[PDB]
Design a protein around this nucleic acid. Structure first.
Ligand code: MG
Ligand code: MG
Ligand code: MG
Ligand code: MG
Ligand code: MG
Ligand code: MG
Ligand code: MG
Ligand code: MG
Ligand code: MG
Ligand code: MG
Ligand code: MG
Ligand code: MG
Ligand code: MG
Ligand code: MG
Ligand code: MG
Ligand code: MG
Ligand code: MG
Ligand code: MG
Ligand code: MG
Ligand code: MG
Ligand code: MG
Ligand code: MG
Ligand code: MG
Ligand code: MG
Ligand code: MG
Ligand code: MG
Ligand code: MG
Ligand code: MG
Ligand code: MG
Ligand code: MG
Ligand code: MG
Ligand code: MG
Ligand code: MG
Ligand code: MG
Ligand code: MG
Ligand code: MG
Ligand code: MG
Ligand code: MG
Ligand code: MG
Ligand code: MG
Ligand code: MG
Ligand code: MG
Ligand code: MG
Ligand code: MG
Ligand code: MG
Ligand code: MG
Ligand code: MG
Ligand code: MG
Ligand code: MG
Ligand code: MG
Ligand code: MG
Ligand code: MG
Ligand code: MG
Ligand code: MG
Ligand code: MG
Ligand code: MG
Ligand code: MG
Ligand code: MG
Ligand code: MG
Ligand code: MG
Ligand code: MG
Ligand code: MG
Ligand code: MG
Ligand code: MG
Ligand code: MG
Ligand code: MG
Ligand code: MG
Ligand code: MG
Ligand code: MG
Ligand code: MG
Ligand code: MG
Ligand code: MG
Ligand code: MG
Lengths: 46, 393, 159, 240, 122
RNA sequence: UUAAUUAACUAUUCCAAAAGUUAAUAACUUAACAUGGACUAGCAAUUUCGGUU
RNA sequence: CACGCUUACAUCAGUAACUAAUAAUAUACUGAUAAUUAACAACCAAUAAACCAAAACAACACUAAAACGUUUAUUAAUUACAUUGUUAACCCAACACAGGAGUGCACCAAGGAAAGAUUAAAAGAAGUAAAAGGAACUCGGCAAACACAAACCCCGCCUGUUUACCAAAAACAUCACCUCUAGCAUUACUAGUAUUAGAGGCAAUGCCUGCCCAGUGACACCAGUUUAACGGCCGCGGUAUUCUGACCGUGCAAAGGUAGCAUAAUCACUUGUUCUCCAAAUAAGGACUUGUAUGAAUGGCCACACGAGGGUUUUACUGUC
RNA sequence: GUUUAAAAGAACCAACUCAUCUAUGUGGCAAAAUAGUGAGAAGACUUGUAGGUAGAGGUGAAAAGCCUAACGAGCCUGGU
RNA sequence: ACCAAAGCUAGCUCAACAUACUAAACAAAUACAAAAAUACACCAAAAUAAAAUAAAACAUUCACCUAACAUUAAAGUAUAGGAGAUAGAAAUUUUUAUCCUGACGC
C-alpha cells in the first residue's frame, strides 16, 4: 500500500549484516574495509 | 546395519598432516614460534596440554572406573523416576510378594467404623477438594503441580484433626527427601531400591502385623507370575558405581524409627511426564519394600532369614484425583531363592476421590447447566485414607 | 588454460579450453629414506623416473624448476640431509647395506651448511632464520658488571 | 550460511525425538525439491530395521520379543509397533494384524525343513516356504531392511536356487539376493492407506505439501502411455 | 537510518545486550545462578599511616628546584651494586657465577612481584 | 524457434589411457574416482531480422 | 512492557531573531544546573542412565500425531556488597505527517479540543428533511433509501491465491482422476523404500471421454509401441415427381468429428427464425440448428451448495429522475 | 460473544487481516490516503523476533508477480 | 536607499632531486553485536579477464587495457590479418659523472 517505511530498525540485524565481525569474516568485506580506509571514512562499519 | 550418526553432523576428522612430517630425519618448519597461524608453514602438532595444577571446574570429567566405589558387577537401581513395563508383575517378582486386591480387614474395619469420622466429613472433604482445585491459587485454573501436594496436605490435616480424639498420633513426624538405599540379591540379580520419595511419615511405635498366619502359610503355595520375553530388570538403571550398605533415611538413635506411610505425588502438568497407574503402583510397592527391608536389617541384622515379626508399611500414591493405597507386609529377607515364604501386599487401585471439577461455570444456550464444584464424589476414598492414617493408633 | 578454435578453423568460434593431466595414485618406494609414499603422480613422472633409473635419482637430478612440487623439494631436502649426515637410522641392523646405498648416491653429496636450505620457500626460510636469531635480551646488569670488571682490571694493571 | 542436519543422534532411543523439517532446501539454502514445507510439527520415532539384533553378543541365537503397543507414526505411512525383549525395547514396522500382547520371533537359523510362517516372525529367506508373502526384506545379510516398508505393500518369495532367494517387489520387479537375508513375513499394517481420501486442499498443507506451480507447461514426448517391458531381475549376489 | 558515529554502548541495544563499561571482573557464576565474588580478585587498597607524616601536597615557593637528571639503569647500578662489586673484587672473593648477593635475579618466576610479566597493577 | 555459428555443464554410447586375467602374437572385464578425442539429447551461449514503397 | 531513538526528559532563566507551518509561551528553540539507585530484566553447569502414552477446565477422546520435565550416579572455584538496561511528550515515513506499528490490562477512575476574529455571495465537499410520482435517470438501481426480499442464466465445484501503486476475475491453485521417471542410505528427496517419492496434465462429484502412430517427439539405440504425448479426425457428382438424400459411382487418407451441446464468452453474414417477458427490447430466458471455423483430461454435457465475478426479471424503497 | 451431538478449510458478527464499489484527494493527511460501504474472521488464518535462498540468479497457489518507493530483470563502483 | 559589490590569502597543479617507501599517536580496551581483562582449538581456498568500441552490420579479428626495459635509428620495414578494419617486430646501431629547479600553472 503505502511505501517509504521499508526500514524497520533493529540493532541485532544491523550489527549482524553490516557489523565489523560480519565485514571481517569474509575476504570481500575485508576489501570493503580496506576501500573505506583508503577513502578515509570516519566510520568503517556499524 | 544402519548407523545412527550422520557424517555432516559428527565431529569431523582432523586434517591430513603436512607432507613434511613423512620425511624421516627432517624437522618441520611450523608457525609455533610466532604463536599464530600463518599460511605456507607446516601445521605444528602439540602434545596434550598438561595443567600441572589441577582446576576443579575446568578439568576433564574423571572416568567411571577411576571412582573408588566402582564395581564390576552391575547393580540394577530403582530410583524415584524409574518406570516399569509390566509394573505390578515386575514389582511382585522383584520383591517376592503376593498381591491381594482389597484392603486388609483391620484397616477396612477402621474405615467402616463411623465413630472414627471427623465432625463434618462430607463438607470438610468437599471444601478441601474445592480449595485444592480452585481456591488455593489466584489463577483461574490451577495446575496439577500446584493442586496435587495441596490436596495431599489438606487430607493430611483433615486426618491430623483426629488427634484430639486419639491422643496417640503425636508419636509421628514427617520427613521430606531422605536418602533411602536398600539393596538385595534376588535370583543372582543385585537390585537396589535407592533414592528419595515424596513424603515419609515416621513413628515411634511399629505397625502391628496385619496378615494372619493362615495367609502367611498359604503364601508358600503361591507362585510368582513370570514374563518370558521381558527381563525383570526392565526399566531399572544398570550402574557399576554403587554401595551395598543398608542406609535408611536417618542415622542411629532416631526417635521416630518405624516408617508408617509413604506418600507419592504425580504432580506433573503433562501426561507423558506423569506416571501411569500401574507404574505408580509398582514404584510405591518397590519403595515400601525398600523401607521395610531397611527397617528389618536395622532391627534384626543383614542375615537372610524369614522374619518371625513381620514389618508392615503403608503407601499412598496421588495423581491429584486418583488414589492408590498399598499395605505391604514384609515377612522374609532371603530373596535369592523363589521357593520359601513370600511377603504380602494389599493394593487398592483406581480409587476416585472425585470424577471431575469445574473451575468455571459452564454455559450452554445462555444458561448455566453445571455450577462450580466437584462433579461426583466418593467419600469411601477418604474413608480408606483416614483408615490408613489411623492404622497406627 | 587457453583458447581454441572449434572445428580447427580460424574463422570459426573461439572457445576457452582447460587441458588437464591424467593423475594416478601410485606408491613409490625410496631407498635413502626407506618409505613407500602414496603419491598422485602422472605418466610423465613415471617416465622421468624410469629415465633416471630410480626414484631417488630422479629427485636428486631434476631441479626445483623441473620438479615444480613443494613435496618433491621436501623429499630432496630430506634425502640430501640424510646423505650429508650419514644417518645410521637408515639401516641400524645393516651397516653394509647402508654403506652400499650411500655410495651409489655420492655424486649428489652436498655439505650440511647447504643441505638444509634447498627445499625451503621464502616464508619458511625467514621463519628458520628468525628461530636461529631468536635470542633473549641479556640484562643490563651483566653488561654493567662486565664494564666494571674491565675498568677494575684496567686500574689494577695501570699501577 | 550452511545449516546443520537435525539427525545428530548416535544413541538409539525409544522416546520420540524432535526433528527440524526443511522445505526442499539443501544445506546451502536453495530449493532442491519443490512442493515441500509448512506441515504439522512432528517428532521422529527411531525404527530398528535390522530385525534380528540380539541384545548381547554372548547369546547370538534366535530370540522372542513381546508387542506392547501398535501406535501411529507421522513419518511413514505404516504403523509402528513397540517390541520388548530382555532389557530393551524397540520400534519396528507393525504387520497387518499385529496387536498389543503378541509374541514375535526373530531367527537366523536355516534348516532343511521349512518353518510355519506367522506374521510377526522374522526368518531368513532360505527358511521360508516358496510362496510366502514378506516385507522389510534385505539386500545384503546384516545391511538392514531398505526394501518394502510402505503401508499395505508386500513382496512375494518366488523360488530359492543355489542358496539364493528370488523375491518379487510391489513394483512387480524381481530381486535376487542371498538366502541368509532376514525378512519379515506378512503384509505391512494400514492396508487401507491407498483408499484414504484427502477431503480438502488444507489436508495436503497439514501433511506438508505446498501447491503446484501455476505455470502451464505443454506436454512433451515424455508423456503418453509408454508400454515398456519389465526390466531384468536386479541381482545383489556378488559372483566371483 | 541508524547512527554510525555515536559510540556503541550497552544503552543502545536490546535487553540481551549488556556490555560492561570497563570495570574489572570480581568473580564467577555459582550453582543456583547467583554470582560468587572472589575476595582475591577485588583490589585491596594498601593505605599507609599519614598521622606522623610531615609532608604536604605543595612545597615552599622559595625552595629551589634541581636540574633534570632522569634516573637511568647505569646510574641505578652505580648507586646500588658498583660499590659492593668493587669492594668484592678488591678483596678478591668475586664470583662471576653467583650474582644473587649483589641484588641480581636470575629468574623472575620465583618472587611475588616480577618485572617483565608485571604481575602488579600499581 | 523449423534462424546462422556453437561453447561450458548434466545424462548416453564409443575409442584411447590405467588396472589386470587366460592360454602357447591373440581374446576378454571395468567398484569409486578420473584424463584426452568423438556421438546422441537436455540445459544453454553469441548475433541477426535487406532495400524501393 | 518489548522493539526502536538516544537527553529531545526535570529545575531555573531568556526569547529581538532562530524551531513550532501564526501568536500567546515552551514537551518541541537557547544557556546553565541536575538526573534513570534492584527486588524487575540481561549474563546466569556439563557427562551417562530410567523414561512410547499430547495440549484443548482434561474425566477421556479425534487426527494433522503435537513446544513446554523430573529423578538417579561423577565432577560443579565457595568467599557479604559483581557488571549491565531504568528519563521522555519518543519509533519507521524528507516534516511537531489524517499513514504503518508486537503484547497484557480496562472503556475511564485515564486522554484530549472540531471554532484566530467576523459576514453568511457564487461554485465545491459532507449531512439532514421534502408535496405528487416511484427507476420515468443512467451503459448499468452508480449513489442514496422508512427497503435490506424472491427468482432465471453464463463462467468457475466449493474455502483459498494473484498483477505492493489503474485489472481480484471467467485467471491460478484445489480435493478427485490420469500420465510418465525411479529397486535405493548417512546434509534436500529421507533419517523415507513403489499404498513410496519426484516431473506434469485436467479439475470435486454424476454420465462419459469416440477414431487415428500418416508426420514430430519419447521409449525402443533398427522394426515395433505410445495420443488422459505434440496433434489431426475428407472431397466431386447423381439419386425416392418440384425440397432433402436413406442409396450409389469415383478418388484420397492414419483415421475421415463419435456421444453430447449449440447463434454460445465460439470469425463474418447476425439485430439468424420463432415463443415468453414489456405499450414498446440489438436486453434476458426456452426452442430450431453444419458450429463447413463446436466437440469430448489443451476434456464434452447436466446438477446441489458457493461467488464484493458477468447479465435479466418481480415487488419494497427512495432526490437517481 | 451467538447458533451448532462440532475448532465442520460450516453459519452471524467483534478484535484482527484484506481491499469490492462510490465520493473526496490529485505538488494531497498520504511518492497510494480519508469517509461510507464491503470480504474472510479456529484457519490453505493473522502476527512478533531471529536466520536462510542474491541477479547468466533467488522466490513465485504464472501476475513474466516480488527481490528496499522506476525490475521483461536490483543497486553501486569500474571499464567510461 | 536596501539587496548588494571589490580585495589576497588559505592552499592546490605539474616536474627535478631524494633518503630508498604502509606518517604521528599508540596508558587501557579493540575481528563477543570492534574498542567488553579472563578457558581445552580447529585453521585455511585457488581454476584465462570480459564487454561497452572499430570493422559504418556482425559471427574470425578490434592498439592501451593496472604483467618493466629505457633513448636515437632500422621502421611503420619484414611479417600477421572475414589478407578487411587493423596489428606489428627482430638482427644490427646511439645514449658522459654532480650543482646550476623551478614554473610565458590557478
Ligand atoms: Mg528510504
Ligand atoms: Mg513425511
Ligand atoms: Mg502415518
Ligand atoms: Mg498435480
Ligand atoms: Mg496448471
Ligand atoms: Mg546513516
Ligand atoms: Mg542494552
Ligand atoms: Mg529497549
Ligand atoms: Mg553477589
Ligand atoms: Mg537450425
Ligand atoms: Mg562475441
Ligand atoms: Mg536473443
Ligand atoms: Mg527488414
Ligand atoms: Mg522500409
Ligand atoms: Mg503503401
Ligand atoms: Mg531519530
Ligand atoms: Mg515564530
Ligand atoms: Mg531545553
Ligand atoms: Mg519510563
Ligand atoms: Mg466559524
Ligand atoms: Mg482548533
Ligand atoms: Mg479558525
Ligand atoms: Mg453553497
Ligand atoms: Mg449537497
Ligand atoms: Mg435522507
Ligand atoms: Mg419526494
Ligand atoms: Mg431506462
Ligand atoms: Mg433515457
Ligand atoms: Mg449500492
Ligand atoms: Mg438491493
Ligand atoms: Mg430489497
Ligand atoms: Mg472461484
Ligand atoms: Mg460442495
Ligand atoms: Mg502466495
Ligand atoms: Mg493493482
Ligand atoms: Mg495482495
Ligand atoms: Mg483494485
Ligand atoms: Mg474476490
Ligand atoms: Mg483453472
Ligand atoms: Mg473416472
Ligand atoms: Mg485449463
Ligand atoms: Mg469434470
Ligand atoms: Mg480423446
Ligand atoms: Mg509415431
Ligand atoms: Mg511409426
Ligand atoms: Mg438442445
Ligand atoms: Mg459468431
Ligand atoms: Mg435495462
Ligand atoms: Mg476445431
Ligand atoms: Mg477447442
Ligand atoms: Mg491434447
Ligand atoms: Mg451471483
Ligand atoms: Mg473467494
Ligand atoms: Mg467474485
Ligand atoms: Mg468459517
Ligand atoms: Mg477504507
Ligand atoms: Mg451517506
Ligand atoms: Mg469495517
Ligand atoms: Mg462476513
Ligand atoms: Mg461467506
Ligand atoms: Mg535473513
Ligand atoms: Mg542475453
Ligand atoms: Mg529465474
Ligand atoms: Mg499467464
Ligand atoms: Mg502477459
Ligand atoms: Mg529498486
Ligand atoms: Mg561495430
Ligand atoms: Mg559510427
Ligand atoms: Mg543492429
Ligand atoms: Mg551496433
Ligand atoms: Mg579487449
Ligand atoms: Mg591465411
Ligand atoms: Mg568488408
Amino acid at each position: 500500500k503505502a511505501r517509504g517505511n521499508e526500514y524497520q530498525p533493529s540493532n541485532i540485524k544491523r550489527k549482524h549484516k553490516h557489523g565489523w565481525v560480519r565485514r571481517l569474516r569474509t575476504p570481500t568485506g575485508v576489501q570493503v574495509i580496506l576501500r573505506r580506509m583508503h577513502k578515509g571514512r570516519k566510520s568503517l562499519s556499524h | 546395519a544402519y548407523e545412527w550418526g550422520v557424517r555432516s553432523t559428527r565431529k569431523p576428522e582432523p586434517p591430513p598432516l603436512d607432507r613434511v612430517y613423512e620425511i624421516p630425519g627432517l624437522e618441520p618448519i611450523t608457525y609455533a614460534g610466532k604463536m599464530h597461524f600463518m599460511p605456507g608453514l607446516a601445521r605444528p602438532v602439540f602434545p596434550p596440554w598438561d595443567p600441572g595444577w589441577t582446576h576443579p571446574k575446568f578439568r576433564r570429567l574423571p572416568p567411571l572406573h577411576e571412582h573408588p566405589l566402582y564395581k564390576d558387577q552391575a547393580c540394577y537401581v530403582f530410583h524415584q523416576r524409574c518406570r516399569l513395563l509390566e509394573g505390578v508383575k515386575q514389582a511382585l517378582w522383584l520383591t517376592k510378594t503376593q498381591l491381594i486386591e482389597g484392603l486388609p480387614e483391620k484397616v477396612l474395619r477402621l474405615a467402616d467404623d463411623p465413630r472414627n469420622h471427623i465432625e463434618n466429613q462430607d463438607e470438610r472433604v468437599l471444601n478441601a477438594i474445592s480449595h485444592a482445585r480452585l481456591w488455593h491459587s489466584t489463577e483461574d485454573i490451577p495446575k496439577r503441580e500446584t493442586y496435587c501436594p495441596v490436596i495431599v496436605d489438606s487430607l493430611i490435616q483433615l486426618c491430623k484433626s483426629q488427634i484430639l480424639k486419639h491422643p496417640s498420633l503425636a508419636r509421628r513426624i514427617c520427613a521430606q527427601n531422605n536418602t533411602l538405599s536398600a539393596t538385595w540379591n534376588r535370583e543372582s540379580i543385585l537390585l537396589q531400591v535407592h533414592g528419595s520419595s515424596g513424603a515419609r511419615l515416621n513413628a515411634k511405635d511399629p505397625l502391628p502385623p496385619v496378615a494372619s498366619q493362615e495367609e502367611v502359610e498359604a503364601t508358600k503355595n503361591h507362585v510368582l507370575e513370570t514374563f518370558y520375553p521381558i527381563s525383570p530388570t526392565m526399566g531399572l538403571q544398570e550402574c557399576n558405581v554403587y554401595d551395598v550398605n543398608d542406609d535408611t533415611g536417618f542415622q542411629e538413635g532416631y526417635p521416630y524409627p518405624c516408617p508408617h506411610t509413604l506418600y507419592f505425588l504425580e504432580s506433573a502438568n503433562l501426561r507423558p511426564r506423569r506416571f501411569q497407574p500401574d507404574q505408580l503402583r509398582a514404584k510405591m510397592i518397590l519403595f515400601a519394600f525398600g523401607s521395610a527391608l531397611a527397617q528389618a536389617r536395622l532391627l534384626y541384622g543383614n542375615d537372610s532369614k524369614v522374619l518371625e515379626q513381620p514389618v508392615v508399611v503403608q503407601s499412598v500414591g496421588t495423581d491429584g484425583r486418583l488414589f492408590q493405597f498399598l499395605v505391604l507386609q514384609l515377612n522374609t529377607t532371603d530373596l535369592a531363592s523363589d521357593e520359601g515364604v513370600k511377603n504380602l501386599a494389599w493394593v487398592d487401585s483406581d480409587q476416585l476421590l472425585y470424577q471431575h471439577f469445574w473451575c468455571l461455570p459452564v454455559i450452554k444456550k445462555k444458561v448455566v447447566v453445571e455450577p462450580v464444584g466437584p462433579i461426583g464424589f466418593q467419600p469411601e476414598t477418604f474413608r480408606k485414607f483416614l483408615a490408613l492414617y489411623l492404622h497406627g493408633a | 588454460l587457453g583458447h581454441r578454435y572449434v572445428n580447427n578453423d580460424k574463422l570459426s568460434k573461439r572457445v576457452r579450453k582447460v587441458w588437464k593431466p591424467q593423475l594416478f595414485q601410485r606408491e613409490l618406494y625410496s631407498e635413502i629414506l626407506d618409505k613407500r609414499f602414496t603419491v598422485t603422480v602422472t605418466m610423465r613422472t613415471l617416465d622421468l623416473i624410469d629415465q633416471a633409473c630410480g626414484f631417488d635419482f630422479y629427485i636428486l637430478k631434476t631441479p626445483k624448476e623441473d620438479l615444480c612440487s613443494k613435496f618433491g623439494m621436501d623429499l630432496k631436502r630430506g634425502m640430501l640431509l640424510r646423505l650429508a649426515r650419514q644417518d645410521p637410522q637408515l639401516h641400524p641392523d645393516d651397516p653394509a647395506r647402508r654403506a652400499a646405498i650411500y655410495d651409489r648416491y655420492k655424486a649428489f653429496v652436498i655439505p650440511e651448511a647447504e643441505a638444509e636450505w634447498v627445499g625451503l620457500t621464502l616464508d619458511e626460510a625467514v621463519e628458520k632464520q628468525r628461530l636461529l636469531e631468536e635470542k633473549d635480551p641479556i640484562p643490563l646488569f651483566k653488561i654493567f658488571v662486565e664494564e666494571l670488571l674491565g675498568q677494575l682490571q684496567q686500574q689494577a694493571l695501570s699501577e | 550460511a550452511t545449516s546443520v542436519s537435525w539427525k545428530s543422534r548416535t544413541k538409539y532411543t525409544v522416546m520420540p525425538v524432535k526433528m527440524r523439517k526443511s522445505g526442499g532446501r539443501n544445506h546451502t539454502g536453495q530449493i532442491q525439491v519443490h512442493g515441500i514445507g509448512g506441515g504439522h510439527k512432528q517428532r521422529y520415532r527411531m525404527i530398528d530395521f535390522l530385525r534380528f539384533r540380539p541384545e548381547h553378543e554372548s547369546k547370538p541365537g534366535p530370540f522372542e520379543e513381546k508387542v506392547i503397543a501398535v501406535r501411529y507414526d507421522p513419518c511413514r505411512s505404516a504403523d509402528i509397533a513397540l517390541v520388548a525383549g530382555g532389557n530393551r525395547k524397540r520400534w519396528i514396522i507393525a504387520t497387518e494384524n499385529m496387536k498389543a500382547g503378541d509374541t514375535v520371533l526373530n531367527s537366523d537359523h536355516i534348516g532343511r525343513m521349512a518353518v510355519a510362517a506367522r506374521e510377526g516372525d522374522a526368518h531368513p529367506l532360505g527358511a521360508l516356504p516358496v510362496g510366502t508373502l514378506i516385507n522389510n526384506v534385505e539386500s545384503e545379510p546384516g545391511r538392514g531392511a531398505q526394501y518394502i516398508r510402505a503401508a499395505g505393500t508386500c513382496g512375494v518369495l518366488l523360488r530359492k536356487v543355489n542358496g539364493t532367494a528370488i523375491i518379487q517387489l510391489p513394483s512387480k520387479r524381481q530381486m535376487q539376493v542371498l538366502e541368509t537375508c532376514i525378512a519379515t513375513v506378512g503384509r505391512v499394517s494400514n492396508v487401507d492407506h491407498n483408499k484414504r481420501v484427502i477431503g480438502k486442499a488444507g489436508r495436503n498443507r497439514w501433511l506438508g505439501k505446498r501447491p503446484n506451480s501455476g505455470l502451464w507447461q505443454r506436454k512433451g514426448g515424455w508423456a503418453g502411455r509408454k508400454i515398456r517391458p519389465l526390466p531384468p531381475m536386479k541381482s545383489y549376489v556378488k559372483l566371483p | 537510518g541508524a547512527d554510525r558515529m555515536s559510540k556503541w554502548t550497552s544503552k543502545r541495544g536490546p535487553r540481551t545486550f549488556c556490555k560492561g563499561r570497563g570495570a574489572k571482573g570480581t568473580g564467577f557464576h555459582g550453582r543456583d545462578g547467583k554470582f560468587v565474588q572472589i575476595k582475591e580478585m577485588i583490589p585491596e587498597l594498601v593505605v599507609p599511616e599519614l598521622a606522623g607524616f610531615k609532608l604536604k601536597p605543595y612545597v615552599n615557593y622559595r625552595a629551589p628546584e634541581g636540574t633534570d637528571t632522569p634516573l637511568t639503569a647505569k646510574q641505578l647500578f652505580l648507586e646500588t651494586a658498583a660499590p659492593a662489586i668493587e669492594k668484592d673484587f678488591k678483596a678478591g672473593t668475586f664470583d662471576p657465577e653467583h650474582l644473587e648477593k649483589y641484588g641480581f635475579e636470575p629468574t623472575q618466576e620465583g618472587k611475588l612481584f616480577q618485572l617483565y610479566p608485571k604481575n602488579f597493577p600499581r
